[PDB]
Structure formats: structure tokens, C-alpha cells
Design a protein around this ligand. Structure first.
Ligand SMILES: COc1ccc(CC[C@@H](OC(=O)[C@@H]2CCCCN2C(=O)[C@H](c2cc(OC)c(OC)c(OC)c2)c2ccc(Cl)s2)c2cccc(OCC(=O)O)c2)cc1OC
Length: 128
């Protein structure tokens, strides 16, 4: 499956290099630039628990998911992961709970200690 590939071939983009966020590029984006902290970012995404029938696709080619990068508007894994993406890039992330919802989780949506899988398209990014 897609998680499997990321495990085996994903690059660990954490700082602590603890394999807490593994990334694969599925489609290469355009030019070289990627977003700075405080850039407003526009993405499509979908996600699932790795071992779970929770799935999320609210922003799956419907409306863009927008947030401001590294302001903590999202889980650490996204502040980390999306920061690395070019405009037009699509990527898979596999995410240990420590870079997501941790032992607390986010009941009932996310259980305690969840690993998450996301497929993210970076549509665009703008200076705050
Ligand atoms: C900095 O730490 C956090 C920041 C934000 C939160 C809330 C969860 C936070 O969720 C996320 O960080 C991740 C990555 C971005 C996509 C949404 N995320 C999710 O995990 C997904 C999510 C989770 C949701 O509830 C947890 C959620 O509820 C509204 C949601 O709505 C669309 C989507 C998932 C649900 C089930 C999965 Cl399985 S994955 C969040 C949810 C919705 C929007 C959002 O930002 C944009 C906006 O508000 O419009 C931020 C928890 C945080 O810590 C746990």
C-alpha cells in the first residue's frame, strides 16, 4: 500500500531524525521555491489512520485547505512536511503520533497514539 512505500522509501524530514514524519514525492512540483514560516499555504489533501477506517478528504479537490505555515495552525507533521513542498507537488506523509495527536489523540476522530497517512497537494503559497 501507499504507507508501505513511504516506510521503505520515504525520507525522514524530522530534525530529531526519529522517522516521525516520512515523506515520498508522488508528483514533482514546479520551480525550486517552497514556503517560509508565516506564508499562507493552499492545499488539497486526504488522510487516514494507518490501521484504521477513519478517513478524511474534506479538502479533496473540493475547497482548498488554507493555513499559515509554522504558526501551529496544524499538527507539527504538517508544519514540517508542507514546508518542504514545491507548488504543484503532491506527496505522501507517514506520521508517528508524536508529530500528530500523541497519546491524547483527538477523540472520537483520532485515537490515542495514532499513526497517520496523508496525501497532500500544495496548490499555492503567499507571503503573510
Ligand atoms: C498545532 O497543533 C494543532 C493544530 C490544530 C489542531 C486541530 C486539528 C488540525 O488537524 C490537522 O492538523 C491535520 C492536518 C491538516 C488537515 C487536518 N488534519 C487532520 O488530522 C484531519 C482532521 C482532523 C480533525 O479533527 C482532529 C478535523 O476536525 C475539524 C478535520 O476537519 C477537516 C480534519 C484528520 C481527521 C482524521 C484523520 Cl485520519 S486526519 C486541524 C484541523 C482542521 C483545520 C486546521 O487548520 C485550518 C483551519 O483551522 O481552517 C487544523 C490540533 C493540533 O494539535 C493536535
Amino acid at each position: 500500500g501507499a504507507p508501505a512505500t513511504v516506510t521503505e522509501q520515504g525520507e525522514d524530514i524530522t530534525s530529531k531524525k526519529d522517522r516521525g514524519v516520512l515523506k515520498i514525492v508522488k508528483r514533482v512540483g514546479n520551480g525550486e521555491e517552497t514556503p517560509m514560516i508565516g506564508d499562507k499555504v493552499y492545499v488539497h489533501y486526504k488522510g487516514k489512520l494507518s490501521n484504521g477506517k477513519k478517513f478524511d478528504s474534506s479538502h479533496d479537490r473540493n475547497e482548498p485547505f488554507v493555513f499559515s505555515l509554522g504558526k501551529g495552525q496544524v499538527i507539527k507533521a504538517w508544519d514540517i512536511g508542507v514546508a518542504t513542498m514545491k507548488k504543484g507537488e503532491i506527496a505522501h506523509l507517514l506520521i508517528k503520533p508524536e508529530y500528530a495527536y500523541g497519546s491524547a489523540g483527538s477523540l472520537p476522530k483520532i485515537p490515542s497514539n495514532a499513526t497517520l497517512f496523508f496525501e497532500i497537494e500544495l496548490l499555492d503559497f503567499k507571503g503573510e
